[PDB]
Scaffold this active site. Structure first.
Site, PDB file in Angstrom:
ATOM      1  N   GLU B 257       0.809  -1.219   0.000  1.00 39.88           N
ATOM      2  CA  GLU B 257       0.000   0.000   0.000  1.00 39.88           C
ATOM      3  C   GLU B 257       0.852   1.284   0.000  1.00 39.88           C
ATOM      4  OE1 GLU B 257      -3.183  -0.208   2.924  1.00 39.88           O
ATOM      5  OE2 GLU B 257      -4.053  -1.985   1.955  1.00 39.88           O
ATOM      6  N   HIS B 275      -7.588   2.423   0.657  1.00 35.52           N
ATOM      7  CA  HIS B 275      -7.821   1.957   2.038  1.00 35.52           C
ATOM      8  C   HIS B 275      -8.662   2.956   2.842  1.00 35.52           C
ATOM      9  CE1 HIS B 275      -5.977  -0.842   5.335  1.00 35.52           C
ATOM     10  NE2 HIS B 275      -7.248  -0.563   5.621  1.00 35.52           N
TER      11      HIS B 275
END
Ligand SMILES: CC(=O)NS(=O)(=O)c1ccc([C@@H](C)NC(=O)c2cc(-c3ccccc3)nn2C)cc1
Ligand SMILES: CC(=O)NS(=O)(=O)c1ccc([C@@H](C)NC(=O)c2cc(-c3ccccc3)nn2C)cc1
Lengths: 302, 299
Positions: B257, B275
């Site tokens: 991420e 996210h």
């Protein structure tokens, strides 16, 4: 009576049910004026979606024509005045699209709450800007439902499972009947300051044209989110743009427009506006149900 | 207790009514973290404060490090464990926000609202392209039946979805009380139209959706991952999307991420978020409350 023409891409169930009823069926698509007229010369019935334009010229030329069926909602592609003038019955399937329109509406509410289209666009642009996004929880929020027909009702029951307070108004549906499907009816003026989200599910009438306008938008809570998956024009498009520009409206979800496709790009291009090319009825299932419901009506007639 | 990040005023409320003395203030530097953490047993953080090995070792009075949220990536877990410091988080505070996003994702997979928006924004009116599917009567398989799993279940049941699932901790009687019929994993794959995962990330859940499980799936399965990156094997998901075995996927999380391999994010049938599962002010306030309650549970 005996021969039916299907001039748009319909689900195969339509042809099957008509043939089961004893009718002859011709399935064609993307036909021009003269092509359609020629096929109709021996047809007493015509089934369309939205692409085929049943104009005054089409109606007058099809001499055997008795019934015009629309596999869906909105008979805008059919000249009702010319049909009534020729004694041609006009049928449609409003019920067939109900679940699909309701699901898209709920989809739009969720999309506005969590900026899902904007987030996907951000990601597809190779960006990871978490700090730029801040969504809202639907739980405990008030959803205003203007129009409590089957679409309005289905939207309400789905959004109630999210813990949304479902309030609304419909002049036909009594407060007792809406209470039975969890919708608290209040007079319009009481609805506006309470909603976090407003969704419209009414037919397009003079009384509903510009239902959401500069005056009603001013009565709304600052940051209201608006959904229009019903008919273009219920939410005054200019008034909505003003509400989005001032921040009175924090977001809008549009499936329908006063002009389709819209030539004015101000709403669609707005960063807080999410939209679809009139996809309310655009599901394999809705198309199947509409095709079935129109074929059954035609068989009921014979 | 020191509150190092921007938190809800209710954090102090529960801590004080519990009997503890609090010190707030945020945007504290490395040395401003070495000092200030002088004489308090607890420290409450969010995402901004980076609880590193240096910070941990300098605060000898420190016994507990609380995170108002899920995922302790900003907390050096090894360093806290070395000094015997307890690290606590609040995954329940984020339950509703994560469940709501997941439901939003399911809806987006059936109707392609994010792709339709992008198409509209490019001046296009592509009706045939975005012909979708109805959720009513479809099967939703829920893998992981904690608070997020059950919240997703009850919301999707209102859409008339058949909710099935599996969780080796949750009993079939508990799942049956929130309308989720449990079946063994191998029986779930051929029944689903939609699969959503809500499990912790563990060796048992790493690549739970893989090439073998995707081949056991119904052709055109739609997949959602709003839990943790790695639960769905990303390489297997791409192969499934490429063949059409998977008709679409909604991803809020990635193995890395931000993801460096853009092949999934760039796929036309993939919808994504950076996210955002816990990205609501309501989840933040709730996490603020939950962590204060945990610190008060010291006796
Ligand atoms: C299946 C499906 O729901 N179709 S539908 O077209 O959405 C639909 C929606 C509602 C109805 C009935 C119940 N209501 C009306 O006709 C109505 C509502 C309003 C109004 C005025 C101002 C503010 C809010 C409401 N005015 N009228 C005449 C029928 C069909
Ligand atoms: C609040 C919130 O729900 N958090 S959470 O992280 O989603 C979450 C999810 C679930 C739980 C409990 C109930 N279940 C497990 O821990 C569990 C499930 C699985 C599993 C393995 C393979 C296939 C399906 C399931 N294995 N384990 C160890 C806790 C938290």
């Amino acid at each position: 009576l005996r021969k039916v023409l299907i001039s748009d891409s319909l689900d195969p169930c339509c042809r099957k049910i008509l043939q089961d009823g004893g009718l002859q069926v011709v399935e064609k698509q993307n036909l021009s004026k003269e092509e359609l007229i020629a096929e109709l010369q021996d047809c007493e019935g015509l089934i369309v979606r939205s692409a085929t334009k049943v104009t005054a010229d089409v109606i007058n030329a099809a001499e055997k024509l008795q019934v015009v069926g629309r596999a869906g909602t909105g008979v805008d592609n059919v000249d009702l005045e010319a049909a009534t003038r020729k004694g041609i019955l006009v049928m449609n399937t409003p019920n067939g699209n109900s679940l699909s329109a309701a699901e898209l509406t709920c989809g739009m509410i969720m999309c506005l709450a969590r900026q899902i289209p904007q987030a996907t666009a951000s990601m597809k642009d190779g960006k990871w800007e978490r700090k730029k996004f801040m969504g809202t929880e639907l739980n405990g929020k008030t959803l205003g439902i203007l129009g409590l027909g089957r679409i309005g009702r289905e939207v309400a029951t789905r959004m109630q499972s999210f813990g949304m307070k479902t309030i609304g108004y419909d002049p036909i549906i009594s407060p007792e009947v809406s209470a039975s499907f969890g919708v608290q009816q209040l007079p319009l003026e009481e609805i506006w300051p309470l909603c976090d989200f407003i969704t419209v599910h009414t037919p397009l009438l003079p009384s509903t044209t510009g239902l959401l306008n500069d005056n009603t938008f001013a009565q709304c809570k600052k940051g209201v989110r608006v959904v229009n998956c019903a008919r273009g024009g219920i939410v005054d498009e200019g008034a909505l743009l003003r509400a989005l520009q001032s921040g009175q409206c924090a977001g809008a979800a549009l499936d329908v427009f006063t002009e389709e496709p819209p030539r004015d790009r101000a709403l669609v291009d707005h960063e807080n506006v999410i939209s679809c090319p009139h996809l309310g009825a655009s599901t394999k299932e809705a198309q199947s149900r509409c095709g079935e419901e129109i074929a059954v009506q035609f068989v009921d007639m014979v």
